[PDB]
Paper text:
AQPs are membrane-integral water channels that are present in all organisms where they facilitate passive flow of water across the membrane as a direct response to the osmotic pressure. These studies show that cpAQP1aa is a water-specific aquaporin with a unique fold on the extracellular side that results in a constriction region. The overall structure of cpAQP1aa shares most of the common AQP structural features; assembling as a homotetramer with each monomer forming a functional pore and consisting of six transmembrane α-helices (1–6) and five connecting loops (A-E).
Because flexible termini are known to hamper crystallization of AQPs, C-terminally truncated cpAQP1aa (cpAQP1aa-243, where residues 243–261 were deleted) was produced in Pichia pastoris, purified, and crystallized. A single file of water molecules is aligned within the pore of each monomer, indicating that cpAQP1aa is in a functional state. The pore constricts to a radius of ∼1.2 Å at the ar/R region, formed by residues Arg 187, His 172, Cys 181, and Phe 50, a width and residue composition that is typical for water-specific AQPs. However, when comparing the channel profile of cpAQP1aa with those of the water-specific channel human AQP4, the aquaglyceroporin human AQP7, and the ammonia-permeable TIP2;1 from Arabidopsis thaliana, a unique pore narrowing at the extracellular side is identified. This region is defined by a novel conformation of loop C, placing residues 114–117 (cpAQP1aa numbering) closer to the center of the extracellular vestibule. As a result, Leu 117, Ile 176, and Gly 180 form a hydrophobic constriction region with a radius of 1.1 Å, ∼8 Å away from the ar/R region. Specifically, hydrogen bonds are formed between the side chain of Tyr 107 and the backbone nitrogen of Leu 119 as well as the carbonyl oxygen and side chain of Asn 114 and 116, respectively, via a water molecule. In addition, the Arg 187 guanidino group forms hydrogen bonds to the backbone oxygens of Leu 117 and Gly 118.
Numbering used by the authors:
A (entry chain A), B (entry chain A), C (entry chain A), D (entry chain A): 1 to 34, 38 to 108, 114 to 226
The structure:
Amino acid sequence: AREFKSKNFWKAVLAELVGMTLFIFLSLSAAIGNTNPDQEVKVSLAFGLAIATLAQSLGHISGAHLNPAVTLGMLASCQISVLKAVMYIVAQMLGSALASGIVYGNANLGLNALSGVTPSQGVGIELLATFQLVLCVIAVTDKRRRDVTGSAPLAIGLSVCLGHLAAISYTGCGINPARSFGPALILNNFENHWVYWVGPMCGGVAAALIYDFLLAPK
Amino acid sequence: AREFKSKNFWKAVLAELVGMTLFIFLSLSAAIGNTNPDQEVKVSLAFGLAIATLAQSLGHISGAHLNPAVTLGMLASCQISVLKAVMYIVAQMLGSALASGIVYGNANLGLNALSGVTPSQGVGIELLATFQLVLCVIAVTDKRRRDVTGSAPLAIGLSVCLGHLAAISYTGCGINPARSFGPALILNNFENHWVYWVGPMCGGVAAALIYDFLLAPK
Amino acid sequence: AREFKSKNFWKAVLAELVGMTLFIFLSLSAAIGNTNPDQEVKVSLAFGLAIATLAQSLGHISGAHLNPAVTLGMLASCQISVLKAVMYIVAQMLGSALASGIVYGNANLGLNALSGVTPSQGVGIELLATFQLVLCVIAVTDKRRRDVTGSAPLAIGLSVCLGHLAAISYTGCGINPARSFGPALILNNFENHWVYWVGPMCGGVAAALIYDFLLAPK
Amino acid sequence: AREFKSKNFWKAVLAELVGMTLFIFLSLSAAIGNTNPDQEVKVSLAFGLAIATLAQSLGHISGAHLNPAVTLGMLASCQISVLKAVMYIVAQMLGSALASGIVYGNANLGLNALSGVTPSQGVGIELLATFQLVLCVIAVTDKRRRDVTGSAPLAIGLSVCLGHLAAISYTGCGINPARSFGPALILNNFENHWVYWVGPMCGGVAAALIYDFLLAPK
């Protein structure tokens, strides 16, 4: 039964849309909330617990990538088809834009922005902070392992939290191109937006290649 | 042995009363503690760790719903009888009113209240923030799964924490009609109280229908 | 081989001494650190992560009670001998006094003290905040269960954290008579000290009786 | 196949280099971020979640020691060869120096420094705060156990977090000689640096001896 014609495939695409819409609605709500060094841990926790909770809730349905950089890492890791990667990323961008429009209707941590770093510094920070996330996703979901006895969704969520703690005061922490894209589109502010695509996507592919080709090869 | 006449049933109802009384006593104690943007993470953590701990302690006895919206989601998911849902919700409301009376004897995060949102905005925020909670409960307790290797009680507690991080600065975060009801009754302040019933109950039913009828169908 | 003459017994007593000394050294170091509403989450986390870590490290050797109220609950639950309970509590008091003397050599959260509550209010707060802890310990270690798939040490540590979030602004949060005793002895300040014995010990026994005689009977 | 000539050995050494570089890049980024009592929980969480995430990601490849004191404890515990300990520590020092150079290019929590304690007090604080970490690593990875049902990487990360909560306001919390070494080398400031070697290494060896020779003997 071909993937494009398969009920399970489109349920998985729907889970990604649903999960992304909730991820961005909840996280942006925390980030805009009710200045910005005070919010850093709260926001970091909100994004990380949002991913932990939605991956626990949907991961068995779609994988709960909720992140084009995770999806691209899985594609580079040959774990998903090109069709799945395209549809997941479309669903992620749509869900993020939908959530952003709800939450919103500059200023705060909703919109990723560089803070005291240049664009090329921001690209490197986003790359390393996404690299560690996609490395964790790939490693903790590696079907060869028998030693992942705790919660894989929680490990991924806490890696999202970690990426925020590291990057939020420099780039606002995107590590997720669809998460950056939603508020950019809604606010019609694409300043430095390419940083939040180039960095995370290179980091996600780099994580798949380093895990799979060097560290724990097939 | 009919449910109404069953010892295990009434032990489960008692666990819900006991667990709800402790959940609200401990969480309200943290929320009233010893202004309100400073408390947000502390309160969010207190409610989430309270649910994580009591679900770990009682979940094998009653399911540790401790939440009419979770109970209604389980009923919509056909996992509990109508009799169980009624008695659980009565036990939850009673436990919350009892705890509230102990803790108390406006002002703070004890009493859910709208803050800078309209009632219909508050209903939508409560709905989405409860939806993600009941989706997590239903998904993480789904008996078909074999992949929930970590702590299901902790996942649910962290989802409670997440719901607070998202909603607390807008609605005070109810996501739990009995949790809202206790302080409302004790303080005799039912202003906007219907928000904290309509939102969470619709969210809980919506979560059961979306999980069970669309995403991971039977 | 009689318990008093058994090598495993005295290794377990030694684990309790060692674990208690580290628990109090690390937690008091955080609590005295470098005013007190600002510290509440930090201190709450330090005590809870200290118990989570030491129970993960020693729980298979002694049970890692590290708490006379847990030990008394286990005795009321008929899971340890009277001899073990006595020696554990002596080891816990000694370890706490030793650690306190190291850390120290009023003022702060090192010494449990009532803050804006009467002694009888403090007894009830300590009782409920210990009750939920010992209920969690007993429930999560219940050998009949097969559903505790996550970390039992982490669940207990997070319950310790929860008890702090609830009680710290009222009583300083003892929920552990040996933890209260060390700084009291070192500071020679036993004001209201009986609160921190009566409350937690009644709570621990109450938790064993309610779990074992009512909720999940043998 | 001799260890020095083995592909798996050098993949493990590479994992340590990679994991250490990410651990220090991410943690130092959080610690320098964007004064120092405000940062304590954020920094404590960043270091602990960094270890939790990288140990979850790499632990099956190298053990994810990421810490000369853990490596020396494993050597004292006879779980790794002398060759492995040397190469791991070289890889850890190199990765930390590399990351430090990236992040940096006094002042803050990047560079471990004594704060209101003497060098010999700092040595004892570093020793106890490392002791509890290496005790946790050794205990939670003990292959004889069957009761470690949760996440071992998360337990170790939370122990790292705990060590920070205890030690950060006194020594900046090294508990990891390569983590101290990187910023010292990059900033060319080795003031009190021996504290951050002597304390943690003695603590790590002490943890192996106490676990293995006293508490849970072979």
